[PDB]
Amino acid sequence: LTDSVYERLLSERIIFLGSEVNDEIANRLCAQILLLAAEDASKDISLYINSPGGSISAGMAIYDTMVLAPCDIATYAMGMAASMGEFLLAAGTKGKRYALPHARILMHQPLGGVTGSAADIAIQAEQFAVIKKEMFRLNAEFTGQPIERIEADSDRDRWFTAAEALEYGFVDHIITR
Amino acid sequence: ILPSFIEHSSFGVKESNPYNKLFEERIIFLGVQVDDASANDIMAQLLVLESLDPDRDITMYINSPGGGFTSLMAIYDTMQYVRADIQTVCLGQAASAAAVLLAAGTPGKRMALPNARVLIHQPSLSGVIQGQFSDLEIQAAEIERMRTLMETTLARHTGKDAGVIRKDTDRDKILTAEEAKDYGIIDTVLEYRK
Lengths: 177, 194
Ligand SMILES: COc1cc2c(Oc3ccc4c(c3F)CC(C)=N4)ncnc2cc1OCCCN1CCCC1
Ligand SMILES: COc1cc2c(Oc3ccc4c(c3F)CC(C)=N4)ncnc2cc1OCCCN1CCCC1
Ligand SMILES: CC(C)C[C@H](NC(=O)[C@H](CC(C)C)NC(=O)c1ccccc1)C(=O)O
Ligand SMILES: CC(C)C[C@H](NC(=O)[C@H](CC(C)C)NC(=O)c1ccccc1)C(=O)O
Hints:
The structure holds 2 chains of a larger assembly.
Chain A: H1 2-11, E1 14-17, H2 23-39, E2 45-51, H3 56-68, E3 73-82, H4 84-90, E4 97-99, E5 104-107, E6 111-114, H5 118-143, H6 147-154, E7 158-161, H7 162-168, E8 173-174
Parallel strand pairs in A: 1-2, 2-3, 3-4, 3-5, 4-8
Antiparallel strand pairs in A: 5-7
Helix pairs in contact in A: 2-3, 3-4, 5-6
Chain B: E1 5-9, E2 12-16, H1 18-24, E3 27-30, H2 36-52, E4 58-64, H3 69-81, E5 86-95, H4 97-103, E6 110-112, E7 117-120, E8 129-132, H5 133-158, H6 162-168, E9 173-176, H7 177-183, E10 188-189
Parallel strand pairs in B: 3-4, 4-5, 5-6, 5-7, 6-10
Antiparallel strand pairs in B: 1-2, 7-9
Helix pairs in contact in B: 2-3, 3-4, 5-6
The complex binds the ligand COc1cc2c(Oc3ccc4c(c3F)CC(C)=N4)ncnc2cc1OCCCN1CCCC1 (2 copies) and a molecule of 2 linked components (S0R-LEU) (2 copies).
């Protein structure tokens, strides 16, 4: 059972964001951090990431939970850490953000849709500008890059190899082991 | 079905159909949802009727649930560009973009039958359009520019201020014939000549 290995790695304080970030994986992932912190508030939690990205709200659930935790969260990029994956990767404890040697990172701006009456779309657009701004503010904070560069580089998909991602600021180390 | 009929004269015999007969009397029929195809048909007719005799009035019978915005502004502009006056007449309903076309007929010549209804509402988007935030910001601006453009042409023809229009179309506003008259959208309510 896939779930038996995942619960064994749980006792080892290892958790996986291995899919698109949606509310169901986020709620599972937020539950796990609450558990583990309840068990030991001084031992680290390892979050391995392999993700296309997904819902920002789902990701903010996870990110805030990561930050309010008593212990440090170590994030590891396996395979792909894209968009919200990249965000959560860069959101782990400084110094404890890792990339495997052949992982790739993708950062870009938010995607969504508009729908409804002109007055409803006007409000949707207010939030597009609010959220975009905050999303860059935070990535600029994780990486150390000026908010002007995050915005410019995020306009269209930018990919980073492990070595490039370490330059930019997404990670602190590249695991050779 | 839609039968055709035969008229005769000493010059000969003419078979035709109701709409043709109407078109001969300079009457256009806008009884469908304004879409691209429809808008083209109506423009074609406006320009053609304007060519045959630009000093005679063109009548548009309107029974429509509205349609797309740029189709609306295609017909609106043609209606305004043409030399001949345009008598607009609401038979069953003129809603959304239809209400704007009803209001846009030349002053004094906008009318409606006693049990007709005019609905006025702001540009909606039933579908979802998707993209990067950068692409949608552009769309939202265009949807806002379209919305306010409807408000100021409506204002131009009802005599009201765009701010009022903008407030009234925030939620759907249904008007009876007499109420549409009061509102500025039409000039007279047709009385039964039977
Ligand atoms: C993920 O979905 C949405 C999330 C939305 C949302 O979330 C956030 C929450 C916390 C948060 C941030 C968020 F952005 C930024 C930040 C910093 N903290 N904030 C505002 N607006 C949203 C609209 C959404 O989508 C609505 C359209 C989809 N509908 C149509 C079909 C299915 C459902
Ligand atoms: C597997 O898919 C994709 C994978 C992608 C990807 O992966 C890698 C990750 C790490 C890595 C290497 C990768 F190549 C080489 C290496 C050495 N290390 N790197 C960049 N771009 C990708 C785009 C992909 O697919 C894009 C569209 C498909 N979508 C659209 C709709 C359904 C699916
Ligand atoms: C951190 C960003 C760049 C990640 C990006 N997520 C999104 O843009 C979301 C994609 C949809 C859920 C499919 N969009 C939103 O969360 C959202 C929030 C508010 C309004 C509209 C859309 C990614 O691709 O991972
Ligand atoms: C925001 C709009 C212009 C986007 C566009 N909507 C339409 O074209 C509507 C037609 C459909 C039958 C809904 N038009 C209107 O809602 C409308 C109302 C009043 C005056 C003019 C237009 C879309 O892409 O769906």
